[PDB]
Every structure is written in C-alpha cells, then in structure tokens.
Design a protein around this nucleic acid. Structure first.
Ligand SMILES: [Mg+2]
Ligand SMILES: [Mg+2]
Lengths: 98, 1070
RNA sequence: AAUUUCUACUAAGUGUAGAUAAAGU
C-alpha cells in the first residue's frame, strides 16, 4: 500500500547513501506482510535517491545510481545481494542502520 | 626568462560557445502568432525525405554512369591474379571507375544548389515530393554536410565505404574466384539439364557461361547486373527456379564429394519497446536467417575434418593468441614456436639476442598474413590434433548458444506481453543481452577462419559454405548496436532543429541579427520581415522595447547560470570568453568569427514525470568526504528541469588568435628551451593499479619534487576546500555493475564518470604545468600493455591524452587577470593540434610520449630489473639455471642468502648495463589466493626439508645434485618470487609495496614501506609512484640527449629511449 | 539534486568545481 512506502521514504530519506538498504523493487504495490520470494522478478539492489513526484507528491526511489534512471515507485527492504534473497527487513531494522 | 612565456599567440583556433536564449518581453507570443516554429520543425522533418530523394537520384546517376563504363585493365587483372605488379594495376582500375564518375556531364550539379533547384524537381515528377524538393528552395546550405559525405562514395580512396572499393576490392575478387569455381565445377550440367532452363528463365538472350568469362565483369557493375548474376548463382523466381549452388548440393547429395559452391557478389534508431522487441523476435527467432546461419555453421564446423587442413586458414592477430590459449595451453605458444623456428634460421650459434633482433623478429611475425591449419598442426605435439580441438571448442560455443536460446523461449512466443518499459525492465533486457552476447561471441570467434583472403590455395569447398553463412551471420553487429543504443538511452532527449525565421541568409554575419547589451545582460536582437549598447552606437531602451511590443524585433537574452544574479563563484570558461568578446582589453585575441545559429529543443520530459526534492526538507549529501551531512533548501530542486521545457539554444563561434604573430614550430622551440635550460622540471603521469592516475614531478636531476595520487580531486572555492574520491565512486559503480541484472547502462555510466574524471585531471595537470614550467611525460599508448588491473583502461586514457592535447592548445587560468600572460586573452599554446590516436607519439610541444617498458618493476635506487626467466619447466633447465649463478651462499652475519649472478651467463639479458648483480633474500614477498612469505625462512625451510647444508658456502654444486622432481619446482618458485619486486595483496587491501633484492652502494635494500610513511620523500613511495618516476626519468634522459646535440641537430635527436640506453641510464644515474 | 552541455556535486542557498567545437555523416 501507500502508507508503508511513505514511512519507508521518510526513513530512508535521512540515511547517508552508503547505509541505504537492499530492496526489492517494482511498480505495482509490494506487500511485505505477504511478499513471498522465489518469484523470478525479484532482484535485491540498493536504494539510491528518494524524491517526490512533482505532480501528486508520490514518493519514488532510484535503484542504484540516480544516473542509472531506474526510478521505481514501490520498494521493500530485504537482506539480499542478488536473486538469492534471504529475508525481508522491517521498518525498524532499517532505522537501526544509522 | 621562463619557458612558457614564449608560447603565447602562436596559431589560430576555433570554438563554438553554446548558450541559451530566453525570449524577452512578448517575443514568444509574437513567434507563436506567426508560427515561426512549425515551418522549421516541418523542414527538419522533411530533411529526411529530401535526403532519401537525393539518395534515389544519386542511385539513378550511379546506375547510369556504371553502364557507360568498360575497363581496359580488367583482363590483365584476371590474368595476373589467378604480389606487387598487381596493386598498381588495381589502383589504376579504381582510378578508372572514379574518372568515369567525375567525368560525366552532370556531376557538377550533384553537390550544389542545382540538384535541389533544377534537377531533382524534374527527375521526380510527382506533385507530392516535388513539394518537398521545392520547400528547401534557398535552403541549400542545410545540405552542406550531406553532400560532403555523399561524394566520398564517388571517390577512389579505397576506404571500406566507396563505390570503387566495393566494385574492385570486394566484387572482382569474388568474380575471379567464381571463374575458378566454374572452370572446376562443370560437366555436372547439361543443356538437356537445368542449364537451358536457367538461361531461358533468367537471361533469355545470351549464354550462362558468359558470366564466368573474364572481360564480362563489366556487366555486374550495375545493381541489376549483380542481381541477375546472383540470380543465376542462387536461384530467382520469375515457378521456383533452382540456382547453381543447389544444383551442386543436389550433386553432392547424390554422391558424396565436397565440391565447391559459388560465392555471390556484394550490393553497392528504434523508437518504441514494441518495435525493439519485434525486431528481436524477427531477426533472432528459431527460424530466422541468423539462427539458420548458426545451424549451417555448426554442421560445417562439425564436418571440419573432411576439408583439407592445408586449405583452412586462421588470420594473424588477436585470433592467434586466442587460438593458442584455447588449444596450446595459454597465450603465447604459437608465437614462441614460430620464434623458435625463426631463431633456427636467422640466429647464429651465439647468444647475441639483441633488441634490434627481437624487434625485427616481431615485425616479421606481425607482418605474416595468416597461418594455415597444417602449419598450426606442425607446431602441435604428439596425439594432439588441432582440428579436433578447434571442432570441439566451436561445437561448445554453438551448444552454449543453444542453451541461451533455451533460457529464452518466452520472448519469442506470441503470448509474450511487456509488463514494464524496456529501459526499466531488466529481466527481458537480460535475456536479450545474453542472447546477443552469445551469438556475437560466436561471430567474433569464427571471424578468424577468414584468413586474410589474399592467398592461393584456399580450400574453396569449405570457404564457400563458410562465407555463405557468415555474411548472413554478421548482421548481429548492427542488431546489437541498435538494441543497446536503445536501452542505454537517457529518458530525455537533445533533439533540436535550427530556426531560420523566413530568411536563408540569417545570422550568417554581424543577416538581421545583432548582439546588444544593457547593464550586465547581453541580448540577441533579430529583426523580422534607459539606453542599450549595440555591438558601439547606442539606442534607446524605450523604442527598442517598443519594437519588441510591435513585432518588428525578436529580442532574446543570452543566458547561462553565470549570467544569473545569484551566481557568486567563478564563471565558466566560455562565459569568460563571451564577456571578453566585448571588452576593451580584448583587441583581436577572441573575436566573433562566422555566424551564430539559433536552435530549438522541445520539452522531452512530460510534466507528469517531473520529480522533485520537496522544499524545506533535509536532503542527504552524497559526498562521504563532506563535513555537512544534509542540506535544507527553502525552495524546490527539480531533477532535469532543463529538459522539461522548450529551450532556444544559441551557438556562437569564436576564433581565438585570428592574427597570430609569434608563428614558429613548437617542437623545435621546446627542444631549444630544454637544451638551454639548466634545471627543467618534468611531470611524469602514470596509470596505477591502486591509483587512477599518479603524478610525480621531478626536477632536472632526478630528484622527486612532488609525488601524489590523483585518486581524489580537490576543489577550492571561497577559501574552503573539499575533496572528492573518484576511486571510491568508481568502486561503487563497479560494485553496482556486479549487482545489476544487465550491465549495458552500468558500463555507460562508468564510461561517462571516467570522462568527467579526466576532465578534472586535465585542470590538475594544467595547473601543475603553469607552476613549474614543467614538461609532461606520458605513456606511449601505441606500444605497451597494462595488465588488466590498471583502472583507467586504454580507451579512456587515449581520451585523456586527447583532452590534454586539446586543452594545452590554449591553456587558460580562469582566476588570473585576463590580459595577463596565462589569462583568457593571452593563453599559452604549448601543444600542436590533435591529429590522430596514432600520431600521439614521441612529442607534442610540451608533451613527450614515452614507452612504458621497465618502469614499474625496476628498483629506483639501483636500477636493478629482473631480466631472468625463473619459471619451472624441467629438471635440466633448472639444473642449468642453478649452475649458471656465479655463487650461491648463505651469509651468516646478515642471516641472508646471497645469489651472486651475472647477466652475461643468462640468455636474453643484453639490455642490462651493470651485468654483475648480487641479490639477497632480504624481506618478505606476497605470492599469489595471496600468501605472505618471509624469504630467508622459506629458503631455510626448503633446504632442511630436502636435506641440504648451507653454512658451507657456494652450495650450487651441493644443490644441483637433488634427484627430486618437486625440489626444483619449489626452488624455482621461491626464486621467482624473490625477484618479484611489486608485491600487492589481491583483495584490494592497499598494501602495494615494492622491495628490491639488491643493495645500493650504501648497503641498504630499497623498500617503499620506508618511504610511504613520509612527506617530502626522495624516492617513490609505492609502485605507482615508481611508474611515474621512471616515465619522468625517461624524458630526463631525452633532455640530456638534447643537451648533447647542437642547436640545429636538435630536430633530429631521436628520443624513443631503447631498453639498452634506458637500463644504462637507470643504473648509472645513481 | 538545479547546468549551454558533461561529470562530481549542494559547495552556505534559484547555486558550487573542472571541462566544453558546434554543425553534418
Ligand atoms: Mg562556477
Ligand atoms: Mg549529474
């Protein structure tokens, strides 16, 4: 939904870029309470910038570098590096990062 | 009496300052109410149409002139082709073609106003496209480039893209080979058989054998002639008629014999995810032309032994190294077998192997065209068949292609629908890139077997099929480039169109255009069909604004963020140039040459896509070396705000130094000044493995003045000083590339980051040059190698050298006073203009290009360099090695092992100068997966483990008695790592020390770890400082050479320092 | 993460530092 990602934006917006988590990204909403791995579309990469859409103030996240232009709308933090994702972090394990 | 002060005002130079024009007043609605931006966009869209029409007329003219042409030199070519009496004749042939082109009575019009004005509005005769070709009436200049490119085909310079080259170098060869193949493959044919039906259905007038005659080549010059010839070759429906190749296939399937097949003659960006994906599905599906080519090449290369091995070939180049790697163990085995067989002929009974001998051997090799397969079989060993190994590796590549196909069944199935956009989807782009990568790896691999072409006994039974398949297979190059350039594409776009304002002669001088200025605002006034300042008769701001309100004027404001009122730092360079255009101190230095150009870029980002940093919210800072870790601005920060609106770019040319006076040769003046100078500095730059670039400034006697890494660029501003570690950014980007699904975008991001980095390093080196009056010392990139750990690769380093040449053509200090020497008005010109990546050699003004041989693995305090070959091969070689040392004993005082050698007793050690070295077991070395090893302890361990006393002395004889196979292996292993000077832990841990096994005159071994813990050090601090130090000392040797010669022989002094001279210098300079 | 444009930024708050030869093919 939108509230989880709004909280995630407010959290991740303040971490220094080298501390940002590894996340699973997509454009349709991702539900961590139900998000199950082993789907051949989930790739754990690291969040970059966290900006707002200028027209309706929806948070969007740049995966990797901003210069890569991989802007997504829904993320979910995970403990993973590649297609081998281990588990899904929570809204406080991301605050413990810094 | 400084050196640089003489290199101002040398020659002329040209640049285009790009700005942004802002419509002033009601100029934009006065433009939209005259629709001055739809005529020009329409013209920019009809440019491509008129280009295609001009191409069609050019093709008509070509097929016209290629009918009224008959050569007189072709029969001689065919008679002498089936090594130097032919190339003159073939260039005569190409000259004949080009003269037939440039000799027509209509060639004058092809590239001037007449071909748009009169010819093409008649050749067409269609009221739809005569509209196009009449719209560009008076706008002939819009084609100036096109014509200048559409005439390089009517020429004879024999580059890969020209009509003459196509017709002669690529077509006549195939025609002659076809004559051979028809003389050979005959009598499996009859007039009762398919020959007469061939003639009747495809030619109908004259015989089919006439197309394998010699002087009947002057019929396939026209594309329809190629078409009818290729028709009788392959088969042409009018009733599907079979061609000669499948008549041969029909014969070779009746009875079994690989009879050669004919060769056909030659013929002289995407915009939507669905188009890209359907192009992929079409060209690369499992029933396409390309997959069929792959299947044919698989059946061919798996039928690879029934072709005569003497007939196959392999081109000479990287292909040979790769083939040896895949067959004969590793990189250099074929080369060393050839070198053995070359020494057995061109080398006497003496060990006199000289660098001139080695260089002539290398040149003779590199000039060899290609290697047969029987030759590469002779170089092999017992029970190793080279064709079996080649067949198995090619079959492995084909099966890997099939596996990658099996991973991608879905992008070909009709059910497939795109979930995400292509640039944001990376599963499907991963699929596409994997497929293209496998297929293009196969394509680049089997490209070798086309071995130079020009050779006698090619097994045409094989090469027929090979070229038939490969000339269809090599379209993957264009497909790959197109798809990649589509994926690595920015979300915005910089597509613009020039605005003319109903005036062909517009802005081309200072026309209806002028540059006004008012206060600190500069304006571009375009007349149509307070007080200002004209560029200096004045005006009145009231009446000029009145003109702007009326419509008789189109005042734009020239603007970039330095003309802003909130800009306080240092202006851009081009901003300073522009502001100086109108200054008083500017006499003629920077002047306004040529005419400007007012372009127009439409908004590329939809305002529903604009993304923003909301105001009054703390933004994280991306620089880890920044004290301030957040930022809170009282306004918004839009990402790519420049591409979300329409923008009138303005290109203004300037000619720097239009009337030079200090005209001379730069190289010879540099040489004279370095001669007459008593202490010239030298800046050695080197590509390190732990450092992107490393600088070492060395005075005129070899004493290090400075030495530091260029990993981090330090920006000074407002007195504050902040640093940026580009090595860490590059490591982050490489890690991201390691994490990503596909790495087409990651690679482009890394390339552009490296380009920006070298744009910072350019300024670093310029401010180093104008501080010491120094002379740069750069690696000669033509000859040499950097062992794949060097971060800055060769492409970006070539771009760096080009950028440095292009900067030093006019060196400017932005902070300096303009009219002062070194300022924008009087910049230094201490380099000649860039010409080519191959002419970047041996000098360019203040830049000396230096070979990088023996620069990093050399002791900088004694000159020692490990010229031995300490690799274990057998018992006999290691026994001779151990018996070749003058003495090998255990020194008990120092608790070391002395290995007193003498490079005279060793092979390939002629470069050395102090031939008598005495090297110990001092220190510890890091072997490679890495492991630290204390050397003396390792020697004692090995000796005791194999039962050997060493306190005796001269244990060479006591040591060459070991019968064990592994003793000499271990011994040569740690003897090899003893002579290892550059030690470095692989896993990125910054320990890159450089120890030397010899002791200097004072009796202490050089160890970089004693100099890395210092500032103001006299010797290099690490291996990369050593590389830069030696690249600088080579230029110091060249400066000494200049000092040896006279003031007229300076221009001839060769400075390509040879290994003999370099080792002599490095070993006596101390 | 603002740019004539590029790169790295935020650099003291609508910008900072360096570089920049465009057009055409
Ligand atoms: Mg600035
Ligand atoms: Mg940027």
């Amino acid at each position: 939904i939108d509230l989880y990602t709004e909280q995630l934006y407010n959290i991740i917006k303040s971490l220094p870029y080298d501390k940002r988590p590894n996340v699973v990204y997509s454009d349709q909403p991702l539900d961590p309470n139900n998000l199950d791995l082993s789907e051949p579309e989930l790739w754990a990469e690291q969040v970059g910038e966290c900006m707002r859409y200028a027209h309706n103030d929806q948070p969007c996240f740049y995966i990797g570098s901003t210069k890569r232009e991989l802007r997504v709308n829904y993320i979910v933090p995970v403990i993973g590096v590649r297609d081998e994702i281990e588990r899904v972090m929570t809204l406080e394990e991301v605050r413990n990062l810094h | 009496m400084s050196k640089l002060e003489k290199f101002t005002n040398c020659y002329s130079l040209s640049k285009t300052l790009r700005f942004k024009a802002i419509p002033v007043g009601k100029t934009q609605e006065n433009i939209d109410n005259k629709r001055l931006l739809v005529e020009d966009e329409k013209r920019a869209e009809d440019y491509k149409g008129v280009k295609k029409l001009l191409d069609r007329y050019y093709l008509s003219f070509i097929n016209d002139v290629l009918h009224s042409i008959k050569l007189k030199n072709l029969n001689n070519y065919i008679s002498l082709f089936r090594n130097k009496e032919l190339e003159n004749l073939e260039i005569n042939l190409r000259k004949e073609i080009a003269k037939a082109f440039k000799g027509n009575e209509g060639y004058k019009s092809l590239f001037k106003k007449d071909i748009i004005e009169t010819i093409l509005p008649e050749f067409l005769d269609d009221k739809d496209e005569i509209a196009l070709v009449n719209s560009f009436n008076g706008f002939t200049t819009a084609f100036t480039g096109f014509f200048d490119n559409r005439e390089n085909m009517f020429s004879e310079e024999a580059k890969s893209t020209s009509i003459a080259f196509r017709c002669i170098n690529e077509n006549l060869t195939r025609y002659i080979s076809n004559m051979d193949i028809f003389e050979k493959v005959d009598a499996i044919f009859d007039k009762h058989e398919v020959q007469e039906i061939k003639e009747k259905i495809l030619n109908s007038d004259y015989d089919v054998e006439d197309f394998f005659e010699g002087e009947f080549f002057n019929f396939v010059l026209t594309q329809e002639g190629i078409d009818v010839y290729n028709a009788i070759i392959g088969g042409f429906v009018t009733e599907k008629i079979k061609g000669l190749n499948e008549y041969i296939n029909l014969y070779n399937q009746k009875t079994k014999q690989k009879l050669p097949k004919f060769k056909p003659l030659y013929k002289q960006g995407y915009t939507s995810d669905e188009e890209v994906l359907e192009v992929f599905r079409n060209t690369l599906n499992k029933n396409s032309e390309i997959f069929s080519s792959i299947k044919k090449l698989e059946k061919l290369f798996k039928n690879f032994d029934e072709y005569s091995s003497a007939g196959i070939f392999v081109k000479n180049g990287p292909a040979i190294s790769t083939i040896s790697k895949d067959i004969f163990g590793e990189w250099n085995v074929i080369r060393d077998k050839w070198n053995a067989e070359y020494d057995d002929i061109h080398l006497k009974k003496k060990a006199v192997v000289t660098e001139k001998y080695e260089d002539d051997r290398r040149k003779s090799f590199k000039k060899i065209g290609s290697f047969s397969l029987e030759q590469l079989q002779e170089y092999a060993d017992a029970d190793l068949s080279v064709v079996e190994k080649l067949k198995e590796i090619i079959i492995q590549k084909v099966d890997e292609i099939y596996k990658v196909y099996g991973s991608s069944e879905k992008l070909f199935d009709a059910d497939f629908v795109l979930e995400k956009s292509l640039k944001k989807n990376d599963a499907v782009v991963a699929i596409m890139k994997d497929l293209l990568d496998s297929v293009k790896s196969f394509e680049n691999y089997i490209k070798a077997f086309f071995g130079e072409g020009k050779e006698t006994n090619r097994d045409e039974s094989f090469y027929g099929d090979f070229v038939l398949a490969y000339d269809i297979l090599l379209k993957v190059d264009h497909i790959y480039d197109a798809i990649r350039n589509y994926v690595t594409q920015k979300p915005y776009s910089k597509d613009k169109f020039k605005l003319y304002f109903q005036n062909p002669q517009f802005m081309g001088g200072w026309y209806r255009a002028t540059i006004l200025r008012y206060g600190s605002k500069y304006y571009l006034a375009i007349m149509d069909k307070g007080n200002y300042e004209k560029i200096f008769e004045s005006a009145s701001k009231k009446e000029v604004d009145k003109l702007v309100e009326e419509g008789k004027l189109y005042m734009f404001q020239i603007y970039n963020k330095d003309f802003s009122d909130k800009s306080h730092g240092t202006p851009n360079l081009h901003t300073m140039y522009f502001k100086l255009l109108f200054d008083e101190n500017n006499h003629g230095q920077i002047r306004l040459s040529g005419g400007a150009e007012l372009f127009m870029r439409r908004a590329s980002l939809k305002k529903e896509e604009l993304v923003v940093h909301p105001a009054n919210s703390p933004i994280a800072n991306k620089n880890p070396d920044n004290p301030k870790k957040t930022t809170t601005l009282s306004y918004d920060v839009y990402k790519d705000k420049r591409f979300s609106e329409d923008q009138y770019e303005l290109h203004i040319p300037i000619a720097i130094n239009k009337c030079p006076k200090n005209i001379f040769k730069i190289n010879t003046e540099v040489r004279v000044l370095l001669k007459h100078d008593d202490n010239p500095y030298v800046i050695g730059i080197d590509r390190g493995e732990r450092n992107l670039l490393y600088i070492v400034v060395v005075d005129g006697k070899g004493n290090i003045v400075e030495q530091y890494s260029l990993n981090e660029i330090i920006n000074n501003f407002n007195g504050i000083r902040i640093k940026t570690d580009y090595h860490s950014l590059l490591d982050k980007k490489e890690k991201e590339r390691f994490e990503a699904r596909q790495n087409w975008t990651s690679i482009e991001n890394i390339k552009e980051l490296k380009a920006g980095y070298i744009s910072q390093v350019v300024h670093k080196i310029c401010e180093l040059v104008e501080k010491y009056d120094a002379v740069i010392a750069l690696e000669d990139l033509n000859s040499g190698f950097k062992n794949s750990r060097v971060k800055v690769e060769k492409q970006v380093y070539q771009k760096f050298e080009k950028m440095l040449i292009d900067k030093l053509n006019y060196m400017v200090d932005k902070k300096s006073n303009p009219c002062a020497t070194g300022g924008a008005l009087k910049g230094y010109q201490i380099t000649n203009k860039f010409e080519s990546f191959k002419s970047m050699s041996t000098q360019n003004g203040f830049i000396f290009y230096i070979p990088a041989w023996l620069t990093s693995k050399i002791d900088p305090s004694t000159g020692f360099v490990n010229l031995l070959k300490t690799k274990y091969t057998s018992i006999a070689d290691s026994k001779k090695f151990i018996s070749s040392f003058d003495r090998i004993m255990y020194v008990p005082e120092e608790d070391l092992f002395e290995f007193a050698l003498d490079y005279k007793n060793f092979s390939r050690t002629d470069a050395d100068y102090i031939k008598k070295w005495k090297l110990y077991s001092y220190g510890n070395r890091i072997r490679i997966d890495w492991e630290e090893v204390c050397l003396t302890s390792a020697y004692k361990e090995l000796f005791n483990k194999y039962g050997i006393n060493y306190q005796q002395g001269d244990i060479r004889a006591l040591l060459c008695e070991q019968s064990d196979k592994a003793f000499y292996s271990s011994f040569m292993a740690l003897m090899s790592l003893m002579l290892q000077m550059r030690n470095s832990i692989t896993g990125r841990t910054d320990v890159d020390f450089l120890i030397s096994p010899v002791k200097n005159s004072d009796g202490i071994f050089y160890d970089s770890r004693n100099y890395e813990a210092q500032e103001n050090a006299i010797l290099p601090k690490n291996a990369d400082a050593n590389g830069a130090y030696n690249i600088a000392r080579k230029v110091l040797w060249a400066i000494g050479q200049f000092k040896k010669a006279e003031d007229e022989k300076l221009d001839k002094v060769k400075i390509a320092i040879s290994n003999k001279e370099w080792l002599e210098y490095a070993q006596t300079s101390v």
